[PDB]
Amino acid sequence: AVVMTQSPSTLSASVGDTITITCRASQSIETWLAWYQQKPGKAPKLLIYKASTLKTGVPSRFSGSGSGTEFTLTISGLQFDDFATYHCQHYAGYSATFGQGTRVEIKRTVAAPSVFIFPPSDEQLKSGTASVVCLLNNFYPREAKVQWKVDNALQSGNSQESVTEQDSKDSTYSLSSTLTLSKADYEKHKVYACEVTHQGLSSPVTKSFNRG
Amino acid sequence: EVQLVESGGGLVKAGGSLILSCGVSNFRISAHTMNWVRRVPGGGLEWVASISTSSTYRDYADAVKGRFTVSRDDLEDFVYLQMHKMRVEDTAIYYCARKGSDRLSDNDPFDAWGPGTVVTVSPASTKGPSVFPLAPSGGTAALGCLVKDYFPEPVTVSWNSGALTSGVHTFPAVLQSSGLYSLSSVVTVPSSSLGTQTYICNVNHKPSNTKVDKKVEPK
Numbered sequence: 001a002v003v004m005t006q007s008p009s010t011l012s013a014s015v016g017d018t019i020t021i022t023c024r025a026s027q028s029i030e031t032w033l034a035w036y037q038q039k040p041g042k043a044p045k046l047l048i049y050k051a052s053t054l055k056t057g058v059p060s061r062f063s064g065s066g067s068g069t070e071f072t073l074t075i076s077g078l079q080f081d082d083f084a085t086y087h088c089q090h091y092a093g094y095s096a097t098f099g100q101g102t103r104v105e106i107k108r109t110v111a112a113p114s115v116f117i118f119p120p121s122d123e124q125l126k127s128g129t130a131s132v133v134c135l136l137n138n139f140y141p142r143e144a145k146v147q148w149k150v151d152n153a154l155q156s157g158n159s160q161e162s163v164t165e166q167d168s169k170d171s172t173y174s175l176s177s178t179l180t181l182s183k184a185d186y187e188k189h190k191v192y193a194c195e196v197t198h199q200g201l202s203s204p205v206t207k208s209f210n211r212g
Numbered sequence: 213e214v215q216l217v218e219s220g221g222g223l224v225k226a227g228g229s230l231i232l233s234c235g236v237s238n239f240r241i242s243a244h245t246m247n248w249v250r251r252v253p254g255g256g257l258e259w260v261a262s263i264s265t266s267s268t269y270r271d272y273a274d275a276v277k278g279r280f281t282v283s284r285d286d287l288e289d290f291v292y293l294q295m296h297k298m299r300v301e302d303t304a305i306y307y308c309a310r311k312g313s314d315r316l317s318d319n320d321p322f323d324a325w326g327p328g329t330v331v332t333v334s335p336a337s338t339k340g341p342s343v344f345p346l347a348p349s350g351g352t353a354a355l356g357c358l359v360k361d362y363f364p365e366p367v368t369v370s371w372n373s374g375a376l377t378s379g380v381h382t383f384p385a386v387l388q389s390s391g392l393y394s395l396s397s398v399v400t401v402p403s404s405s406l407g408t409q410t411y412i413c414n415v416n417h418k419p420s421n422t423k424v425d426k427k428v429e430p431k
């Protein structure tokens with residue numbers, strides 16, 4: 001019944017900065033806490049255990065502290081390699097509970113996306129399928145909402161989206177959502193719209209097209 | 213009364229992997245030599261694997277040897293079958309059985325069987341990515357390449373053989389409800405440079421040995 005609460009869920013920081021990630025236990029867990037680094041796709045890598053014991057090979061810039069309920073991960077002088085997710089973990093004999101995770105990313109200013117809608121290619125249409133694509137280009141922060149509105153009717157369970165990593169130079173994100181319909185379904189409707197909701201937008205942007 | 217239940221069957225590509233589990237009722241696995249048998253479409257039965265009492269000895273059919281692994285969980289009464297580097301000929305109904313009698317002997321028949329789980333090995337190991345253009349329309353615009361119904365992880369894309377790098381965004385692949393992947397690759401270019409400049413994506417699918425190039429033009 002031990003509940004682990006990490007804070008913040010997302011930490012925006014610049015290179016060279018000294019940042020702290022807070023982890024909270026619902027009840028006393030003494031020092032049975034472990035910090036892990038996890039980069040997209042790759043498996044979690046153990047950094048600290050016994051709340052402060054730094055594993056062999058882990059840089060000196062990493063720091064562990066705390067006991068009972070309050071725990072702290074400290075990265076002094078941020079390196080590009082340090083930019084990833086951090087998971088705090090209460091490790092018991094035959095059980096464990098993790099934190100929600102902390103995504104440590106590069107801070108930059110709020111940037112509204114450039115939205116582009118792509119109708120399905122005639123080539124694909126002939127093959128019995130229709131893939132309608134929406135692009136959200138170079139936006140900040142990562143949190144963005146996409147809604148598909150076929151003839152004003154909102155869609156659900158036909159769309160699939162994927163997001164790129166933070167840009168090397170500009171520090172923004174890109175999202176691409178693909179609405180997938182049969183040739184038959186696609187030809188029953190006229191107006192295909194993509195409504196985008198984001199922090200850098202005064203109101204949601206709706207990019208649209210008609211069949212021909 | 214004695215029952216056995218196999219779980220984990222389904223469809224797999226050639227070269228793939230799939231694990232089958234066997235669960236039981238009204239007896240403990242502990243003292244029984246557990247076995248797996250398959251019914252090939254041809255009609256006959258092929259003895260697959262055998263696991264001796266407390267995993268002492270493990271025997272396999274010649275074809276399945278070095279690809280399959282038999283395992284036992286005596287404490288929770290479970291039998292496992294690991295199937296790797298899977299061949300089309302491995303397509304069969306898989307039954308888990310026990311060597312048994314009223315008094316256990318040194319050589320008993322398969323007195324109890326499970327109902328059977330269906331395992332189907334598809335001929336095609338890799339799929340061909342179908343490439344589609346994401347055709348354009350304030351001084352700047354975007355175009356792209358939709359890499360579809362293909363497989364399997366991973367596909368690489370480059371634009372103008374590698375010449376165009378600035379503005380390029382190649383998105384994480386998305387697993388579609390079919391079992392096939394789909395990804396998009398886009399690039400932002402000025403609206404002016406449309407008619408003049410030529411744009412081509414370079415799709416590289418190393419598993420299937422596929423290399424596709426498609427030009428993105430408006431209308």
Ligand SMILES: C[C@H](O)[C@H]1O[C@H](O[C@@H]2[C@@H](O[C@@H]3[C@@H](O[C@@H]4[C@H](O)[C@@H](O)O[C@H](CO)[C@H]4O)O[C@H](CO)[C@@H](O)[C@@H]3O)O[C@H](CO)[C@@H](O)[C@@H]2O)[C@@H](O)[C@@H](O)[C@@H]1O
Pocket residue numbers: 242243244245246264265268310311312313316317318319320321
């Ligand atoms: C052997 C079939 O696979 C068999 O297995 C299950 O029953 C077990 C089996 O165990 C065998 C037995 O040892 C032999 C034998 O009794 C005798 O000739 O003496 C020797 C040792 O003193 C030995 O070679 O027990 C050993 C270890 O316990 C195992 O190596 C061997 O698997 O036989 C007895 C009954 O004879 C059972 O108590 C065992 O549980 C059942 O699946 C059975 O039905 C199968 O026919």
